[PDB]
A paper describes a structure:
[name], formerly termed [name], has been identified as a repressor protein from [name] that regulates genes involved in N-acetylglucosamine (GlcNAc) utilization. [name] acts as a negative transcriptional regulator, and binding of effector-free [name] to specific DNA operator sites blocks gene transcription. With more than 49000 deposited sequences, the [name] family of regulators (gluconate-operon repressor, Pfam family: PF00392) represents one of the largest groups of bacterial metabolite-responsive transcription factors. Their tertiary structure can be subdivided in almost all cases into two distinct domains: an N-terminal DNA-binding winged-helix-turn-helix (wHTH) domain and a C-terminal small-molecule effector-binding and oligomerization domain. In [name] and the entire [name]/[name] subfamily the C-terminal effector-binding domain adopts a so-called UTRA domain fold (Pfam family: PF07702) that is structurally homologous to the enzyme chorismate lyase.
The crystal structures of the complexes between [name] and GlcN-6-P as well as [name] and GlcNAc-6-P were solved at 2.1 and 2 Å, respectively. The two complexes crystallized isomorphously and their asymmetric unit contains one entire [name] homodimer. GlcN-6-P and GlcNAc-6-P are bound to [name] in an α-anomeric configuration. Each phosphate group is coordinated by the N-termini of helices αE1 (Thr90) and αE5 (Ser165, Ile166 and Tyr167) as well as by residues Arg133 and Arg135 presented by β-strand βE2. The sugar moieties are predominantly recognized via direct or water-mediated hydrogen bonds involving polar main and side chain atoms from residues Phe89, Glu145 and Tyr228 as well as via hydrophobic interactions with Ser88, Arg211, Glu222 and Ala224. The phosphorylated sugars stack against Tyr167 and form an additional CH/π interaction often observed in sugar–protein complexes. Whereas the acetyl component of GlcNAc-6-P is indirectly contacted by Ile209 and Ser226, the resulting additional space in the binding pocket in the case of GlcN-6-P is filled by a water molecule and an adjacent ethylene glycol (EDO) molecule from the cryoprotectant solution. However, upon binding of GlcN-6-P and GlcNAc-6-P, the DBDs are displaced even further by an additional 25 Å. The ligand-bound structures, however, now reveal an even more distinctive rearrangement of the DBDs and the formation of a novel beta-strand β* that interacts with the C-terminal strand βE7. This newly formed beta-strand β* appears to lock the DBD in the observed ‘upward’ positioning.
Author numbering:
A (entry chain A): 0 to 242
B (entry chain B): 0 to 241
The structure:
Amino acid sequence: HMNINKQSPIPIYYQIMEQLKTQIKNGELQPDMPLPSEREYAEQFGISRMTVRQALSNLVNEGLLYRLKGRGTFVSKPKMEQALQGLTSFTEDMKSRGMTPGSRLIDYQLIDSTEELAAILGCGHPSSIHKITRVRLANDIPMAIESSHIPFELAGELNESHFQSSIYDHIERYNSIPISRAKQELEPSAATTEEANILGIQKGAPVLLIKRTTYLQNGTAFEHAKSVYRGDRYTFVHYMDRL
Amino acid sequence: HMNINKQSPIPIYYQIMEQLKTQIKNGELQPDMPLPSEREYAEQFGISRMTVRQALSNLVNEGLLYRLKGRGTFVSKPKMEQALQGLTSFTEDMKSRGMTPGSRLIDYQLIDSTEELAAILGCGHPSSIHKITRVRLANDIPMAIESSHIPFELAGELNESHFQSSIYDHIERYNSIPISRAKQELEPSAATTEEANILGIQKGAPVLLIKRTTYLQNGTAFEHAKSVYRGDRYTFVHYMDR
Ligand SMILES: N[C@@H]1[C@@H](O)[C@H](O)[C@@H](COP(=O)(O)O)O[C@@H]1O
Ligand SMILES: N[C@@H]1[C@@H](O)[C@H](O)[C@@H](COP(=O)(O)O)O[C@@H]1O
């Protein structure tokens, strides 16, 4: 199934870890069928069982796999439940679940309003708009890519210390008005080459494409954001009623 | 670029229609850009413009393309906005959009409860559970595949006429109580070969996978459902507050 090249300078255990990772990334491994045994892998490739064991144990310690006594070794399927109706920040979302939020700046641009953005935000035109594009990390694992358009006057000058923490925190502080309401539009999608590369997932893997338009308590729109969320680590939850 | 085969029994305009359809299907030509002109198509394939015009006009009449004056012909992107917070039936969703809801039965089985299903539904074990798997149609265009699990006692015996109609309407009538509340779980997915073939979309095309547990006004769960919705024809909407 996988491919081991003994002539390569990459150690065999490392090859196994990487190829199993690539297999989980590619969907090639069912999540609750057991992995091939140490024996099966070792015989298949003509390598030591201890080499196989080294790889599998490392993967367990990285949480990508888990052992069930008497049943074998299984692919981990960690998925966070994300509530759709509570208006929150990524930073709030992560801290609530005891994980450390982070960000890496993909791109920052101050841009001229378009008439389309101006219609969405109800902001001036012509005006200047922050365009803040970040990958959002949970314990240094990329979870999403978000591109947030915010009218300049609702945020003022921004620097790397804003980008590396919570934009919503800054928005409330800077405007002295809390964040109160949003509208979101959800669409399933396949990760583009670039999205996959930044997210560490396979090209074309399932992502949820989300557009959010977010409002201050005085009813001013301060954000129009377009984001892609990793399908493989998220479950989006909401409720419904007749009203 | 398309592949026109003039030795084929299939008429050229029909090829153009089908290959354009396939191209839209496979997301191969941008929805914001205008198609190549009548002339460009004709000159590329060494065919008559009138053949091209026949194919494009047909596709306009089918609503797959549209003509913007002076700018060109464009790929239509019919989106239907689906509100996530309002508990409704497919039948209700369509009617309120002035469209005709239909269903095609994929499979019906009356099945034994499992400890897993009984936990979800709070139903009896062992008991019988309806398992109703249908294609849901909007004016004869497939929109979703749904597999609904419903405890026998909350629905009684069902036949093909129930399947072709609204299950939710039956449920409220049978139980003399309104359908009141639900929890849904959402995740994006790629359409399986089977899901794609039934939905008329490309293998691997984006779909929304949705699990619904649905409750009657008295707190009784009556449905556990697993569905896939075509990503291309839906926009799911909800609101948020603090
Ligand atoms: N999907 C939203 C984004 O639309 C928003 O821009 C972000 C701000 O998060 P933070 O305040 O941590 O910068 O929160 C969520 O993730
Ligand atoms: N997603 C829901 C399904 O979970 C539900 O089973 C169906 C019933 O629709 P109907 O009453 O038309 O049969 O409505 C929607 O489509």
